[PDB]
Ligand binder design. Structure first.
Ligand SMILES: *C(=O)[C@@H](NC(=O)/C(=N\OC)c1csc(N)n1)[C@@H]1N=C(C(=O)O)C(=C)CS1
Ligand SMILES: CC(=O)c1ccc2cc(N(C)C)ccc2c1
Length: 254
């Protein structure tokens, strides 16, 4: 099988789940195996934020300090002086994977415990938010992990089904469509011209993730999660694994 070949080729473990929402055909490989979700959780966090707040309430200015800056703060490091609105924080979190922005958003929705509660409410019993900035340690722990199947199901719930009213659904989808961080991942494995909404993640042990909604020109979208990890803490990743895995998925569905 082509997925086993890629694990071999890239010295990594792959978790794959894809759902064609038109046919209900699926493509699965280790679909229920846990991986650190890393920044992919930002998408679900905004889904919860959008459930909590009116669109107008997203204009609430959030102030923060240099103390709130963490490992990677591409947008938030530029606005300590003014703060940023919740809307601008959601834009930073989703389109740049600004870690500080995610932290600020999580703080506003009541932290990981509160995020976990709201995910459970949409039917997600697997995803396990435990900490702000989900933190190295060891593989095996279920804290800050999910599965390809659960991330697909939760992303679909927010973005395409009924967990958000349509105007808020529109905001989430648009931010994800205009992601700047996933050019070499799922987007690189999809046919040209086909619109993609995605959120990437990356983490130690060579963890490299992308979750996405992919629209054919015409017809119902596919929802895909491609998760990966490696056995060494210091191992880096290769984006090409995710792109190639996506090509395998598209071939199996198309
Ligand atoms: C999201 O995944 C986030 N990742 C991290 O901050 C890291 N771990 O999170 C548990 C991390 C960065 S470097 C390292 N060894 N671990 C931000 N997301 C992306 C992304 O592409 O989405 C990054 C590339 C890094 S920073
Ligand atoms: C945002 C944050 O609090 C945080 C904390 C510890 C981290 C450790 C890392 N490695 C050991 C690689 C990487 C990112 C990290 C981010």
């Amino acid at each position: 099988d082509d997925f086993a070949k890629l694990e071999e080729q890239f010295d990594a473990k792959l978790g794959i789940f894809a759902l064609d929402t038109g046919t209900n055909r699926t493509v699965a490989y280790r679909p229920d195996e846990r991986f650190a979700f890393a920044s992919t959780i930002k998408a679900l966090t905004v889904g919860v934020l959008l459930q909590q707040k009116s669109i107008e309430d997203l204009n609430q200015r959030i102030t923060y300090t240099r103390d709130d800056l963490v490992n990677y703060n591409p947008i938030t490091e530029k606005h300590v002086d003014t703060g940023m609105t919740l809307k601008e924080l959601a834009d930073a979190s989703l389109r740049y994977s600004d870690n500080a922005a995610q932290n600020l958003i999580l703080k506003q929705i009541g932290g990981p415990e509160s995020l976990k509660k709201e995910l459970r409410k949409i039917g997600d019993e697997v995803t396990n938010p435990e900490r702000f900035c989900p933190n190295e340690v060891n593989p095996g722990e279920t804290q800050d992990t999910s599965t390809a199947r659960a991330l697909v199901t939760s992303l679909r719930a927010f973005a395409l089904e009924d967990k958000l009213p349509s105007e808020k659904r529109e905001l989430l989808i648009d931010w994800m469509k205009r992601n700047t961080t996933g050019d070499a991942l799922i987007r690189a494995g999809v046919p040209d011209g086909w619109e993609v909404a995605d959120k990437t993640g990356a983490a130690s042990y060579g963890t490299r993730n992308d979750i996405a909604i992919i629209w054919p020109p015409k017809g119902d979208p596919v929802v895909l999660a491609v998760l990966s990890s490696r056995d060494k803490k210091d191992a880096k990743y290769d984006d090409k694994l995710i792109a190639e895995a996506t090509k395998v998925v598209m071939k199996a569905l198309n």
